[PDB]
Structures are given as C-alpha cells and as structure tokens.
Amino acid sequence: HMYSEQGINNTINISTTSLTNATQLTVIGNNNSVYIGNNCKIVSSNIRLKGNNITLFIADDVEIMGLVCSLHSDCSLQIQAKTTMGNGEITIAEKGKISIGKDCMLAHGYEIRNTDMHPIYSLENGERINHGKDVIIGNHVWLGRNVTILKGVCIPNNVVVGSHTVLYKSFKEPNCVIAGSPAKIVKENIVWGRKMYHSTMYDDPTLNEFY
Amino acid sequence: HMYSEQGINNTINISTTSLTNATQLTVIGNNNSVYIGNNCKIVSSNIRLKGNNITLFIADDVEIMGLVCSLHSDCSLQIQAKTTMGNGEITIAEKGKISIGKDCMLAHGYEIRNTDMHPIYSLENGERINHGKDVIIGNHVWLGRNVTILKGVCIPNNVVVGSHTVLYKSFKEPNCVIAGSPAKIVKENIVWGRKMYHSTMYDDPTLNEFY
Amino acid sequence: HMYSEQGINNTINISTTSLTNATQLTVIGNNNSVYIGNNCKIVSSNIRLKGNNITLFIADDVEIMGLVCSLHSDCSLQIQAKTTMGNGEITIAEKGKISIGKDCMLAHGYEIRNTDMHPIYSLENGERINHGKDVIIGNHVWLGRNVTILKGVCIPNNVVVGSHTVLYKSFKEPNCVIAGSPAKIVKENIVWGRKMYHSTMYDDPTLNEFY
Numbered sequence: 001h002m003y004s005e006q007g008i009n010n011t012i013n014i015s016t017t018s019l020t021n022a023t024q025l026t027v028i029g030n031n032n033s034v035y036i037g038n039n040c041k042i043v044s045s046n047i048r049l050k051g052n053n054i055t056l057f058i059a060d061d062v063e064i065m066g067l068v069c070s071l072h073s074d075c076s077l078q079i080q081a082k083t084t085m086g087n088g089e090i091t092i093a094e095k096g097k098i099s100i101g102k103d104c105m106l107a108h109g110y111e112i113r114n115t116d117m118h119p120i121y122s123l124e125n126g127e128r129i130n131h132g133k134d135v136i137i138g139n140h141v142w143l144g145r146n147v148t149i150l151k152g153v154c155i156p157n158n159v160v161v162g163s164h165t166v167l168y169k170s171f172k173e174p175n176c177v178i179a180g181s182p183a184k185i186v187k188e189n190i191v192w193g194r195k196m197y198h199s200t201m202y203d204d205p206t207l208n209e210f211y
Numbered sequence: 212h213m214y215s216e217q218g219i220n221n222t223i224n225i226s227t228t229s230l231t232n233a234t235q236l237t238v239i240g241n242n243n244s245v246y247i248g249n250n251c252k253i254v255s256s257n258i259r260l261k262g263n264n265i266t267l268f269i270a271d272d273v274e275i276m277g278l279v280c281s282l283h284s285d286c287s288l289q290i291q292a293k294t295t296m297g298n299g300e301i302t303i304a305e306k307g308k309i310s311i312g313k314d315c316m317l318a319h320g321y322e323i324r325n326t327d328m329h330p331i332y333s334l335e336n337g338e339r340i341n342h343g344k345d346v347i348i349g350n351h352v353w354l355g356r357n358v359t360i361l362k363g364v365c366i367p368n369n370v371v372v373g374s375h376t377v378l379y380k381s382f383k384e385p386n387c388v389i390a391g392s393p394a395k396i397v398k399e400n401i402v403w404g405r406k407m408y409h410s411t412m413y414d415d416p417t418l419n420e421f422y
Numbered sequence: 423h424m425y426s427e428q429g430i431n432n433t434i435n436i437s438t439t440s441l442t443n444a445t446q447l448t449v450i451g452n453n454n455s456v457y458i459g460n461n462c463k464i465v466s467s468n469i470r471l472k473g474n475n476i477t478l479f480i481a482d483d484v485e486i487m488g489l490v491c492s493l494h495s496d497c498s499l500q501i502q503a504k505t506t507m508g509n510g511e512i513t514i515a516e517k518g519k520i521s522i523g524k525d526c527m528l529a530h531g532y533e534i535r536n537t538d539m540h541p542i543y544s545l546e547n548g549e550r551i552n553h554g555k556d557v558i559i560g561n562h563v564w565l566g567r568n569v570t571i572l573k574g575v576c577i578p579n580n581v582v583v584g585s586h587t588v589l590y591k592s593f594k595e596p597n598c599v600i601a602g603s604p605a606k607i608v609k610e611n612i613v614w615g616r617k618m619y620h621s622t623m624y625d626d627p628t629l630n631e632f633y
Binding site (some may be wrong): 105142144145160164177179187190191194195197198199200206210211 | 335
C-alpha cells in the first residue's frame with residue numbers, strides 16, 4: 001500500500017489482506033494513526049488527514065467505494081466491522097469525532113459532518129453558538145441514497161434513514177425508519193437486510209441477532 | 212442502431228426514423244422487448260435490461276438526453292408520445308412497472324423508482340413490509356429540476372411538480388402544482404406549457420386540449 | 423482577458439488587476455455590459471450573456487470558482503464587493519434581476535434563479551400566473567452548501583441559510599439563521615464570520631460593523 005506522509009510519528013497500519021486500489025491516503029502532520037483491518041476493500045477513495053493527533057480506524061470486512069474524507073487535528077473517524085459505503089463525503093473538524101457502527105450500509109450520496117465549518121456568534125454576548133458536535137451512527141444503520149447527517153446527530157441501532165432525508169437532531173428509538181421533512185419516525189419495530197427476500201426475514205441467516 | 216444482446220428471444224424494434232447517438236442499450240437475458248417509435252431522439256443514455264420478460268416501450272416523438280435506466284426481470288417501462296426528458300435516473304425492480312404519459316416534460320435531475328432495493332421486515336411477524344409498488348405519471352406532467360418520485364406514487368394528469376420536491380405518496384387532483392415539504396398542492400386549476408408566452412395560454416395552439 | 427463577442431455596442435470592462443483563468447465569457451447580442459472590478463478572481467466559470475441590454479456587474483475583491491451563469495435579454499446580475507462564491511448556478515430570464523450584496527459567502531452547490539423557465543397559466547381566465555420575480559440577497563449573507571434560492575426571494579442582511587435548504591419566500595428579519603422544511607427562522611440575533619474562532623466574535627476585527 002502506497003501513500004504520502006509529510007511529518008513524523010505517524011502510524012499507518014493497513015492489513016496485508018486488504019485492498020486499497022485507486023485510493024489516495026495523504027497524511028500531513030504528526031502523531032496521526034491509520035488502522036485498516038483485514039479483508040477490507042477501500043477503493044477509489046480520497047482520505048486526507050491534515051493536522052496532528054488524528055485517528056482513522058477501519059475494522060475488518062469494511063467495503064468503501066468513492067469516499068472523500070477530510071480530518072483535521074485531534075479528530076477521529078471510526079468505522080466498525082462489515083460496514084459498506086458507496087460514494088460520499090465525511091468531514092470532521094473542531095477536534096471532533098464521527099463513529100459508524102457495525103454492519104451499516106451507506107448508500108450513494110451521503111454527506112456526514114460534525115461541523116458548520118464557519119462560526120456563528122451571539123450578538124448578545126459575542127460568544128460562539130455553533131460549536132462542532134460529534135456524530136454517532138449506531139450498529140446496523142442503513143442510510144438511503146442522498147442522505148445528509150449534520151453535526152451532533154446520534155442514530156440508534158437498526159435504523160433505516162429514508163433517501164433524500166436531512167437529519168439535524170438525534171433520535172433514541174431503535175428498530176425504526178426515519179424519513180420525511182422534517183425527518184420523523186415513520187415506521188417502528190422493523191429490521192432491514194441487504195439481500196432482497198420476497199417474503200420473510202427468517203429466510204436470511206444473517207439477521208438472527210435482531211429478533 | 213447497434214446494441215449488445217446476451218440471450219435469446221429478444222425483440223429490439225427501433226424505428227428507422229429515430230436517432231440513438233451515444234446511447235448504449237444492453238440486453239442480458241431472454242424474452243425481452245424494446246420498442247422505440249418514430250422520430251425519437253434517445254441520446255447519450257445508458258439503458259440496461261438485465262433479466263427475462265422485460266418490456267421497454269417508447270412511443271413516437273420522444274426526446275431523451277442522458278437517461279440512466281436499469282430494468283430487472285418482468286419489469287416494464289412505458290413512455291408515451293411527445294414526452295421529453297433531460298438527464299436523470301429510472302430504476303425498476305421487483306417485477307414492477309413505471310408508466311409516463313403523453314407530452315410530459317422531465318427536467319434535469321429526476322430520480323424515479325418503484326423499489327427501495329433492499330428489504331425491510333416487521334419484527335412482529337418477520338414479514339416484508341416494503342414491497343415495490345408501481346409508479347404512474349399521468350399525461351402532461353412537468354417535473355421541475357431535481358425531483359424525486361418514489362415507489363407507489365401516482366401523479367394525476369396536467370400536474371406541475373416543483374423543483375427539488377420529493378414525492379412519497381399519490382395525489383388525485385389534476386391540473387395543479389405540487390411543491391413543498393412535505394409535498395402538497397400549492398395551486399389548483401392550472402395548465403403548463405413549454406414555450407414561454409408573456410400573457411396567455413390562448414396564444415399557444417398546442418394547449419387547446421386542457422380547457 | 424479573452425472572451426467571445428457576437429454583436430455590437432457591447433462594453434466589456436475587466437480590471438487589469440483581476441484574474442479570470444479558465445473562465446469562458448460569451449456575449450451574443452447587442453448593448454450588453456460587463457464590469458469586473460479590481461482584485462477579483464473569477465475562475466473556472468462559464469458566463470453566457472445571450473440577448474440585448476444585459477448587465478453584469480461584479481465589484482471589487484470578489485472571488486468566484488466554478489459559477490455557471492446564464493443571462494437573457496434585459497436581465498441584470500449584480501454582485502457586490504468582497505463576496506465569495508464556490509461552485510454553483512445562476513439563471514436569469516424574463517428581463518429580471520438578481521442582486522447579491524457585500525461580503526456574502528456562497529458555499530458549494532447553490533442554485534439561484536428568478537424564473538421557472540416555463541409558463542403556468544390559470545384555467546379560469548388563461549392568464550400567466552408564474553411570472554419571473556427578482557431575487558435580492560442582502561449584505562453579509564452566508565448560503566450553506568447545496569442551497570436553492572427560487573424566484574422572488576429576498577434575504578435580509580446578515581443571514582445564514584442552512585445547508586440543503588430551499589427558499590421559496592422572502593424573509594424580513596436580519597441577523598438570523600434560516601433552515602428547515604419548510605425554511606424557517608431557527609435562531610435570532612446572530613452574526614457569522616469566515617475564520618473559525620473558538621470563542622468570540624470580538625476576536626475577529628473584520629466583524630465590527632454588525633454589533
């Protein structure tokens with residue numbers, strides 16, 4: 001695996017069983033850490049760590065195609081095992097963190113960020129009022145196409161976010177579909193799978209952990 | 212007209228008066244049917260029929276630029292006469308159908324589909340609850356730019372859908388503008404035309420059938 | 423600075439201190455006027471004036487990257503000093519005007535227009551009911567990413583429009599954030615800046631005019 005470093009005390013640990021074809025990984029700064037686990041396919045992506053003390057953690061069996069990712073100083077991106085991601089954008093700044101859980105499915109066109117990238121202040125006392133806020137995406141979350149996840153949003157486990165939805169606020173209820181304008185729970189007590197089965201979840205051995 | 216077939220009992224009937232420059236039509240499977248009527252211009256498009264028993268019907272005088280279309284087994288796309296379509300995406304799966312009526316105008320950036328492409332099941336009994344559902348777009352419908360039409364949606368005749376609108380549900384009232392979040396009827400008893408006339412529909416001979 | 427003219431009585435006044443690399447400016451028609459002030463950077467853009475009596479006014483210190491702009495007869499685009507604009511689209515037709523104030527920041531993916539580009543008529547009397555309407559963006563407005571501003575919209579001074587918001591209607595209150603579906607005021611009595619300061623607006627000498 002080839003990449004560009006400018007700086008020192010960086011640790012780039014990419015498993016020999018993983019593939020990174022057509023991916024550019026650039027590390028500019030010091031004390032940054034990259035971990036890519038076994039049997040990953042991180043393809044046609046552009047990942048830029050610019051700053052110090054940055055952490056990128058990608059667990060085993062993760063498949064990414066066409067991610068554009070920018071991390072700044074003291075920021076963390078963690079993506080857990082068996083997650084798949086199509087084309088999309090992740091930006092982290094303001095020393096923040098974004099976490100994506102196990103076996104998520106992120107469809108084409110996601111935009112996920114913990115930051116507005118410019119400050120907004122109160123006229124009453126001058127104080128900044130739009131500080132960055134971490135994003136937490138739970139286990140087994142499916143983002144439909146063209147979903148935008150903004151700062152501070154926490155998504156519960158086993159959730160479907162409907163295509164073309166923008167989330168500004170966190171939710172607490174697991175096992176639901178969230179969609180609409182504004183985003184709201186539109187269906188409760190569900191589970192999603194990858195492979196289209198015509199009739200029943202019991203036909204899909206991969207889903208036993210949810211019921 | 213050149214195209215790729217892999218399979219048999221396919222029928223590809225493209226009128227000798229129609230143009231298909233820079234269009235890729237791929238048929239992979241058996242017993243599929245393609246009809247393109249007279250005086251069509253189907254340009255810079257990518258149309259893939261992968262499966263068996265697929266029907267693609269495009270009537271006379273249809274102009275398409277930059278359509279990306281995927282059809283799977285037993286699916287049907289029907290587009291009626293004088294309809295125009297700019298760049299966009301149509302996906303049909305789950306043995307479903309999408310119909311577009313006569314003299315529609317689909318502006319840049321449409322996404323139309325009858326499927327979520329992955330299953331959602333009820334935790335209560337395991338049953339699938341997001342089966343594909345047909346899409347019916349009536350006669351003389353105008354989709355403004357960047358409109359998304361999701362599964363099951365039926366749009367009445369002589370409707371304008373405002374740009375950047377997502378439709379999840381069907382409507383019944385013809386001769387209206389639907390726009391907003393959620394999509395709603397914002398104007399009733401109207402008719403749209405193609406050519407900008409400054410003052411009156413009576414100046415446009417092409418609109419006599421609507422009043 | 424090179425450009426294409428087809429027609430006469432055009433005036434193309436581009437300051438010798440401004441840069442227009444990779445920008446195509448095309449003027450097709452008569453009596454059109456282009457002014458680009460000092461120390462501008464108008465880059466990788468495509469600006470087409472097709473018609474007569476068109477005015478394009480760009481003041482000093484304006485930086486534009488990847489604007490696609492179309493103006494038709496008797497239309498006006500005015501962009502005031504120190505405004506910055508990333509990639510985006512502006513369309514003006516129906517002899518209308520779009521104005522953008524001083525020191526605005528237009529993030530990637532804006533779409534701004536004064537026109538529906540096709541007519542909608544009343545069935546009751548045949549009259550056109552969707553005439554073009556001017557767009558006025560005030561001083562010190564920040565459009566977040568992928569914002570759409572439709573015809574007739576006036577935005578007050580010192581406003582933030584949240585990313586992925588569509589505005590259909592004007593607002594009157596300055597010093598606010600507008601976001602959501604439908605767009606609404608979500609925060610009042612604020613001011614935004616460009617450079618991320620961790621704690622206070624008083625640290626940014628460029629903002630003294632707002633409190």
